[PDB]
Design a protein around this ligand. Structure first.
Ligand SMILES: CC(=O)O[C@H]1C(=O)[C@@]2(C)[C@H]([C@H](OC(=O)c3ccccc3)[C@]3(O)C[C@H](OC(=O)[C@H](O)[C@@H](NC(=O)c4ccccc4)c4ccccc4)C(C)=C1C3(C)C)[C@]1(OC(C)=O)CO[C@@H]1C[C@@H]2O
Ligand SMILES: CC(=O)O[C@H]1C(=O)[C@@]2(C)[C@H]([C@H](OC(=O)c3ccccc3)[C@]3(O)C[C@H](OC(=O)[C@H](O)[C@@H](NC(=O)c4ccccc4)c4ccccc4)C(C)=C1C3(C)C)[C@]1(OC(C)=O)CO[C@@H]1C[C@@H]2O
Ligand SMILES: Nc1nc2c(ncn2[C@@H]2O[C@H](COP(=O)(O)OP(=O)(O)OP(=O)(O)O)[C@@H](O)[C@H]2O)c(=O)[nH]1
Ligand SMILES: Nc1ncnc2c1ncn2[C@@H]1O[C@H](COP(=O)(O)OP(=O)(O)NP(=O)(O)O)[C@@H](O)[C@H]1O
Ligand SMILES: Nc1nc2c(ncn2[C@@H]2O[C@H](COP(=O)(O)OP(=O)(O)O)[C@@H](O)[C@H]2O)c(=O)[nH]1
Ligand SMILES: Nc1nc2c(ncn2[C@@H]2O[C@H](COP(=O)(O)OP(=O)(O)O)[C@@H](O)[C@H]2O)c(=O)[nH]1
Ligand SMILES: [Mg+2]
Ligand SMILES: [Mg+2]
Lengths: 427, 346, 426, 426
């Protein structure tokens, strides 16, 4: 029942920081690993349990922050893999010249972890699409990892190149090149828009000035509910492969949206009275989508609802019945139902120094929909435009990345878009 | 005006014949009509239902101006395409011959091959020389030969590497005259000596010592024939013009990253791909801007594009040549270079 | 990693001297080379610009090149004579005298090896060489001659490393030589071909900024160089400490050059305000971007609003909201959609570092790849042409072995540069 | 929300200086810009008129425009030189010299952008711009020239925002220029077309008030401007704190302009009494309305009782009974039914704010849209005509490129204004 986490570039690492902070909080584990859970922490005889994680950055910077900051004592030094020269927002360099120089070490460290791990369920990769050290390197690693562990589940939690705003101008390229690897090798991928989150921080948490710290904490909190939640023994312990069983209808379509519906400020925690139906209803409102997408313009393929803390199955069922009664949101016509429920007994995790106020229960939604496919069209336009001018193409050609690879990457993305169109239309 | 795209393959040998269990990816079904095989009926998956695949299930149709195959002899393939280019040179404007492919795909072999067969350079001189001696009684022939290699973005004197690259500067005139600095220029006294210099050049070319192609030229080269014929008669219009024929060669390019791609292999590999990009930029700009009204072409991307500033772009004609492999071991490379040729066509 | 800083000519040396003042102060380094800073992050990447000599003496990873002894003397006599290493002081025969051919082709060429030997010595003291930074003028003669001379030589040694330069551009109304076009044209001819990124700074533009915004009664060269040094630091400051979004010379190039050759940038710096007006500052990200995208605060003479933005880098300093920054970037591109090149989806590349410049609560620096810069090239080309048509002053270069062909070739190639920028402007 | 205050010309600047004294005092702001008030409501809407700079320094959302350096100097040398922001001090070439064409058409036109840039900077520091307030004279030349010049420019930028102005009107018996009609006529010609509301204040009327009611031995400009500033505050005071009935520039316009073009208002102020007579005051709503509807307390020279009231705004300050106020409004309209325009059912718009002017127990301000004001326009038009018939002084504007057609067109259009007010009077 154990798993391995992987972190790349800067984003994957920073997100990881939030995740491992949460896990420590959940299990009472100290910054030096001391406990005063074995699926995240390798058992240590001294009590200093150590994270099952691989950290990669071709420019140690963010890892040095970890090495010098808190939880430097938590993580094992062998896990903190760094390079010398960064990929620098170039998928091709991360994929090849630079990334390939450490990929051997990376795989060796993974192997050690996998040899230590008895009941390995799968992996959880944290990456972006912007940087090459995230995008390109992950592409390399996932291919290699897929070969070694064809029977293990590969989760990818990605930071989706936001449609409204971004920070690098060559993102479209790195994003589209990643797509044909993730779609090929991953078992389930998640796409998260920073801008959608910032918007959530503004509206729900009432934050005028939001940053990566709080943003990442929300993302990590979702992952806790997806994974760690199961490992606390609830009423309905839905397996990670059980998620796939019910969420995924085809060989493809590995793109669920992960939302969190108890997002709430400390002030609201006093006035607001939440419950099962209230929170469940909130997660189907085109506001907490965690991505620039409006479900109301597509259909629901599948929807897993994960509950934590003080919930009962009766109310959950009733809320779902109400949703199906509402009939505002559309479901795939050839999918009789699409609702699956996971239930914990353990409460929601609270971050000291956070904002997300303490609640008695929580809901996460993992939903497959045809609406999300529209987001790729926006990326297609961005790509097509820059591609038409071959802008920045020489940075990938300088690596040796075949021009035709870009056209192939697009076609694979377009295929994916087409599949979702067929799902919604056909009956 | 408009350019011509022509294509041909190496062959398959006992190395491919031994491999009984393989499906070919190249199938020329007619003249100018290439079908990319084989779709997808694989036993390594399913695919026993209405296809939801992007292209893995269909066939890719490539249409060119003159597609050839292993059946057609280079004696015809060359002349069919370049006999008019040679004549074009003498129509008041210059011309040029291109090539394309991955390393080991028949460049070096197709320009000449085993020393008993015809090829690009041999037939160029064979045909021209016959025309020279037939027309020697009408016009005076002052023809010269320019030799050139490109390696690490550096211009080398193909025949005399003893001269430093600083002594080679690529310029062009407003008359489209080829202005290259101190270079060992020679004359086409006979094809034997011409080809001997070509061999001397190929010896001097700086090669790979890595892959199975370890002769592997790994450098570009351009051989330019500068024809300055003059009149034997005196009259009011007696002003015979001049023009040239560029023979373009490329290093060859392997998959984005090879299993031992280190150091100088990365460095030159980048320089090769950058040079190929530069050609792609200029070719695509040229063709698209011929469709449009204004032609701004990025001739400064490479020294080759400076070298071809007018050979590729002026009031002239050229043929694109691409070498194709029928093996699935070159599936991506061949397919991508086919698309390249088609984009160059349009 | 480590970066080599080479200074060439009086101009470049004076700018560099101010630069090393700034970053030594930034990293807590006193005039002995000893570290007495208050942070630990000052030593986290001190290796980038300093050798750690026995006794913890931090020694500028820099090479001081000049052909006019006396300027080099003023460096040794200055506060950093105890800082710079003596074998990095490279000088000999008297200077070019605004003669590019003397600087590049002949007299300077004789002393190339004395520089390159030091380059090698510096390289082999490094754990990972990232690239080179050259500081020089574009018309001085020695700085512009030795500049492109050394650039060529260095790239031959390190073809895969980053060639960065900060070049002071001939300004319309600020002169001091009548062959400024000859030297600039001959220089840029070789600059483009052998450079990965170059920054164009006009003394005239700085003269305007240092009064219009800083209200200086007597703007001196030490103040103009100070403005330059601020932006020089910003370019690489991201490499020397933690930040929300990292950045790099390579990263910038990847996001700043869309077309190989178009790697000329305009530099700018945020909070520009006089000491009596600082009390009226809001010190907000909005405020900073108002200044960063203000044409009047650009250190190139050409006003960006006559062209378009191929791509922009906005590197911020200090604690701030990532959303706040992103919002402002969006507002800017929405505000002037006609200025930004539509071929790019997100026209602005951003980066945010956790540490503001000591004494500032929050700052930033601006790097613009605009098409407007073509106009500076045009102006210079016209001046060059006018003289060249009469072969004016040509004998000064003829006597060094320079022919006419070089000059016509250079200009032809300068026209290509302008044409390319115009190609990508509507 | 936020409102921009622009001052134009010496007159406008002196009035504005007094205005900012008043409201800074109202909101507890000292001469450093620091807040030391006793209420919390002083900071509730401080953003309306102040930027909050680092250190809590509150900076007038105002632009200081003049063409005569020296007046601007007196502002900087005054108590608010530490208050106003230095980049809001816009001045250059010497002033028009009572030449409207210099102020609007030529010399002033050259410096428009230097104002508008500041306007934009102010706009982008706002969360929600409501409108603009212009303070100027109607005959000065620069204040009247730059006035309508900037009004046109600003509306082009912000056509949907509120254009408010406080204009000092040429007074029958109080002069200082013989081209007062030329400047006024040329000004109002453009004023009407581009203004949403304008207030007409006569120095003569104030000269009368400041003696008749305030018994001042030596009424100075600082005292006349003081009277003006009181009413200026009242117009927008409702926006800056709580009240039983809110009010607004828009709200007023909606209830004060019945016919698009007729947006000229007479201003007044309640408790007007000398310091020896204040002890005899009742301080009741009745008393206040007796003063507010007293023709002698109107700050326009024209006596309202020669015309009719199209609509009246009565804005009250401090704790009071809503019924008491309503009763008095009824009594007034019943008392002088012949004065009020019968076409309107309730001729008086009221508002009541919870906070009186510091030091007063209860106050109010009066805004009247009367038809009587037409007589001021007539008088000026007649003076203009008499001169214009001889083309007197015309060469001063001819030399600036102004033709006769403008002058005849302006007067024709001035006649329309008067005619319209007469149309709506019996
Ligand atoms: C009391 C106080 O806050 O003083 C400020 C100050 O008044 C102002 C006006 C500073 C001042 O800068 C100048 O007046 C200036 C002089 C010549 C050329 C350019 C600028 C200041 O001198 C500059 C100084 O800058 C720094 O300390 C930065 O770390 C800066 N350092 C240097 O440039 C430097 C100067 C001397 C010796 C060593 C370094 C820096 C900026 C970017 C990257 C690295 C370092 C600061 C904040 C101030 C003073 C001291 C008055 C300003 O400039 C900078 C670069 O910060 C000018 O507009 C800004 C706004 C600041 O508020
Ligand atoms: C002991 C005492 O009660 O003194 C009163 C006073 O004697 C009288 C006579 C004041 C006095 O006003 C004048 O004498 C005056 C001088 C020049 C121009 C106009 C008026 C007073 O000066 C004015 C002052 O007004 C205020 O405090 C208001 O808040 C007013 N403030 C200013 O005008 C102001 C003056 C100087 C510096 C900063 C602001 C205000 C009114 C409307 C909107 C905002 C602010 C008051 C009540 C008084 C004194 C002090 C004697 C009166 O005026 C006002 C505007 O209240 C004149 O008739 C009223 C009746 C008042 O009772
Ligand atoms: N959600 C989230 N996104 C981040 C965070 N940090 C960076 N990003 C995003 O990730 C993008 C770049 O991803 P990375 O792979 O981490 O970039 P990098 O680590 O510098 O790797 P290279 O850029 O290739 O050198 C940025 O444009 C951001 O949009 C973070 O902390 N949280
Ligand atoms: N049409 C052909 N028939 C028989 N042999 C061939 C043919 N084409 C290529 N070859 C052989 O394959 C080997 C040649 O590779 P070539 O020399 O053809 O590679 P290349 O394109 O010049 N490689 P590179 O220099 O790396 O770009 C030669 O020894 C040839 O004999
Ligand atoms: N920015 C800046 N430019 C300078 C300075 N001093 C000189 N220059 C410029 O540089 C040019 C001279 O370059 P210089 O270093 O003297 O070259 P050299 O004379 O060949 O050694 C002049 O034309 C100036 O425009 C300075 O302190 N700062
Ligand atoms: N209300 C008031 N009006 C003034 C004051 N000073 C001047 N004026 C009037 O404004 C006119 C001059 O305007 P001014 O600001 O000097 O315009 P400018 O001369 O063009 O700059 C004079 O005719 C006066 O009637 C003052 O302090 N208060
Ligand atoms: Mg990185
Ligand atoms: Mg070869």
């Amino acid at each position: 029942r154990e798993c391995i986490s992987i972190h790349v570039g800067q984003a994957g690492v920073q997100i990881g920081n939030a995740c491992w902070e949460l896990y420590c909080l959940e299990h009472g584990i100290q910054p030096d690993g001391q406990m005063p859970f074995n699926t995240f922490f390798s058992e240590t005889g001294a009590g200093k349990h150590v994270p099952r994680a691989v950290f990669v950055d071709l420019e140690p910077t963010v890892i040095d922050e970890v090495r010098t900051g808190t939880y430097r004592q938590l993580f094992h030094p062998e896990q903190l893999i760094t390079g010398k020269e960064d990929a620098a927002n170039n998928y091709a360099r991360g994929h090849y010249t630079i990334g390939k120089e450490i990929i051997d070490l990376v795989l060796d460290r993974i192997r050690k972890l996998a040899d230590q791990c008895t009941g390995l369920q799968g992996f959880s990769v944290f990456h972006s699409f912007g940087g090459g050290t995230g995008s390109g390197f992950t592409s390399l690693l996932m291919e290699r990892l897929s070969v070694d562990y064809g029977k293990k589940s590969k989760l990818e939690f990605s930071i989706y190149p936001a449609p409204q705003v971004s920070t690098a101008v060559v993102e479209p390229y790195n994003s589209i090149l990643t797509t044909h690897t993730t779609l090929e090798h991953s078992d389930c991928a998640f796409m998260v828009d920073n801008e959608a989150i910032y918007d959530i921080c503004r509206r729900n948490l009432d934050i005028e000035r939001p940053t990566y710290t709080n943003l990442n904490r929300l993302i990590g909190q979702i992952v806790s509910s997806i994974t760690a939640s199961l490992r606390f023994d609830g009423a309905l312990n839905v397996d990670l492969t059980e998620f796939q069983t019910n969420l995924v209808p085809y060989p493809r379509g590995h793109f669920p949206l992960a939302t969190y519906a108890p997002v709430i400020s400390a002030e609201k925690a006093y006035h607001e009275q939440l419950s099962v139906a209230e929170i469940t209803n909130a997660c189907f409102e085109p506001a907490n989508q965690m991505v620039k997408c409006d479900p109301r313009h597509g259909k629901y393929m599948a929807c897993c609802l994960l509950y934590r803390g003080d919930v009962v199955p009766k109310d959950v069922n009733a809320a779902i019945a109400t949703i199906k009664t509402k009939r505002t949101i559309q479901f795939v016509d050839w999918c009789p139902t699409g609702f699956k429920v996971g239930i914990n007994y353990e409460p929601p995790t609270v971050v000291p120094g956070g904002d997300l106020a303490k609640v008695q229960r929580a809901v996460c939604m993992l939903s497959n929909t045809t609406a999300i496919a529209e987001a790729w069209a926006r990326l297609d336009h961005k790509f097509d435009l820059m591609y038409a001018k071959r802008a920045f193409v020489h940075w990938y050609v300088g690596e040796g990345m075949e021009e035709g690879e870009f056209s192939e990457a697009r076609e694979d993305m377009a295929a994916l878009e087409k599949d979702y169109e067929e799902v919604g239309v056909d009956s | 005006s408009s350019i011509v795209v022509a294509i041909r393959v190496r062959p398959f040998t006992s190395m491919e014949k031994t491999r009984l269990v393989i499906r070919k990816i190249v199938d020329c079904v007619d003249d100018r009509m290439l079908i990319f095989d084989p779709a997808d009926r694989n036993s390594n998956a399913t695919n026993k239902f209405s296809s939801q695949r992007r292209r893995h299930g269909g066939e890719i149709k490539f249409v060119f101006d003159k597609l050839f195959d292993e059946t057609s002899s280079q004696a015809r393939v060359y002349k069919e395409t370049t006999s008019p280019l040679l004549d074009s040179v003498l129509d008041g404007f210059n011309s040029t011959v291109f090539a394309y492919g991955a390393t080991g795909c028949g460049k070096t072999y197709t320009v000449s091959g085993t020393p008993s067969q015809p090829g690009i350079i041999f037939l160029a001189m064979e045909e021209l020389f016959n025309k020279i001696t037939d027309l020697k009684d009408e016009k005076d022939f002052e023809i010269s030969l320019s030799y050139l290699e490109i390696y690490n973005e550096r211009i080398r004197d193909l025949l005399k590497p003893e001269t430093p690259s600083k002594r080679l500067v690529i310029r062009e005139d407003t008359q489209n005259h080829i202005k290259v600095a101190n270079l060992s220029y020679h004359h086409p006294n006979t094809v034997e000596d011409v080809m001997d210099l070509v061999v001397q050049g190929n010896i001097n070319r700086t090669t790979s010592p890595t892959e199975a192609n370890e002769v592997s030229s790994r450098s570009h080269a351009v051989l330019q024939i500068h024809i300055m014929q003059t009149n034997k008669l005196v009259d009011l219009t007696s002003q015979h013009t001049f023009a040239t024929l560029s023979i373009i060669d490329l290093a060859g390019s392997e998959r984005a990253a090879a299993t031992r791609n280190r150091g100088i292999r990365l460095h030159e590999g980048a320089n090769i791909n950058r040079s190929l990009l530069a050609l792609g930029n200029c070719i695509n700009a040229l063709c698209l801007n011929d469709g449009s009204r204004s032609c701004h072409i990025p001739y400064r991307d490479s020294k080759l594009t400076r070298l071809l500033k007018f050979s590729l772009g002026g009031n002239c004609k050229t043929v694109m040549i691409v070498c194709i492999s029928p093996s699935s071991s070159h599936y991506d490379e061949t397919l991508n270079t086919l698309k390249y040729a088609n984009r160059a066509k349009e | 990693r480590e970066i080599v800083h080479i200074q060439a000519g009086q101009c470049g040396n004076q700018i560099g001297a101010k630069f090393w003042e700034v970053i030594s102060d930034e990293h807590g380094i006193d005039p002995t080379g000893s570290y007495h800073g208050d942070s630990d992050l000052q030593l986290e990447r001190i290796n980038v610009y300093y050798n750690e000599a026995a006794g913890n003496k931090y020694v500028p990873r820099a090479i001081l090149v000049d052909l006019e002894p006396g300027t080099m003397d003023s460096v040794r006599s200055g506060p950093f004579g105890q800082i710079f290493r003596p074998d990095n002081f490279v000088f000999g025969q008297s200077g070019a005298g605004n003669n590019w051919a003397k600087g590049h082709y002949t007299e300077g060429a004789e002393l190339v090896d004395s520089v390159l030997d030091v380059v090698r010595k510096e390289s082999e003291s490094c754990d990972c060489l990232q690239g080179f930074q050259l500081t020089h003028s574009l018309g001085g003669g020695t700085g512009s001659g030795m500049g492109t001379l050394l650039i060529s030589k260095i790239r031959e040694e390190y073809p895969d490393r980053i060639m960065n330069t900060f070049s002071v551009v001939p300004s319309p109304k600020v002169s001091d030589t009548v062959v400024e076009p000859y030297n600039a044209t001959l220089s840029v001819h070789q600059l483009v071909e052998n450079t990965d990124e170059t920054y164009c700074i006009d003394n005239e533009a700085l003269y305007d900024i240092c009064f219009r915004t800083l209200k200086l009664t007597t703007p001196t060269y030490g103040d103009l160089n100070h403005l330059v040094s601020a932006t020089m630091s910003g370019v690489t400051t991201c490499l020397r400490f933690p930040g929300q979004l990292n950045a790099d010379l390579r990263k910038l190039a990847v996001n700043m050059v869309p077309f190989p050759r178009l790697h000329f940038f305009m530099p700018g710096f945020a909070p520009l305000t006089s000491r009596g007006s600082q009390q009226y500052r809001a010190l907000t990200v909005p405020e900073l971007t108002q200044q960063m995208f203000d044409a009047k605060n650009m250190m190139a003479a050409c006003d960006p609003r006559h062209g378009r933005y191929l791509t922009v880098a906005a590197v911020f300093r200090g604690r701030m909201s990532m959303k706040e920054v992103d919002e402002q970037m969006l507002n800017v591109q929405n505000k002037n959609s006609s200025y930004f090149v539509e071929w790019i989806p997100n026209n602005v590349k951003t980066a945010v570092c956790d540490i503001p410049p000591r004494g500032l609560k929050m700052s930033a620096t601006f790097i613009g790849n605009s098409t407007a810069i073509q106009e500076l090239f045009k102006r210079i080309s016209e001046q060059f042409t006018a003289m060249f048509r009469r072969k004016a002053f040509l004998h000064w270069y003829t006597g060094e072995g320079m022919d006419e062909m070089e000059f016509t070739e250079a200009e032809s190639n300068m026209n290509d540069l302008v044409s390319e920028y115009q190609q990508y402007q509507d």
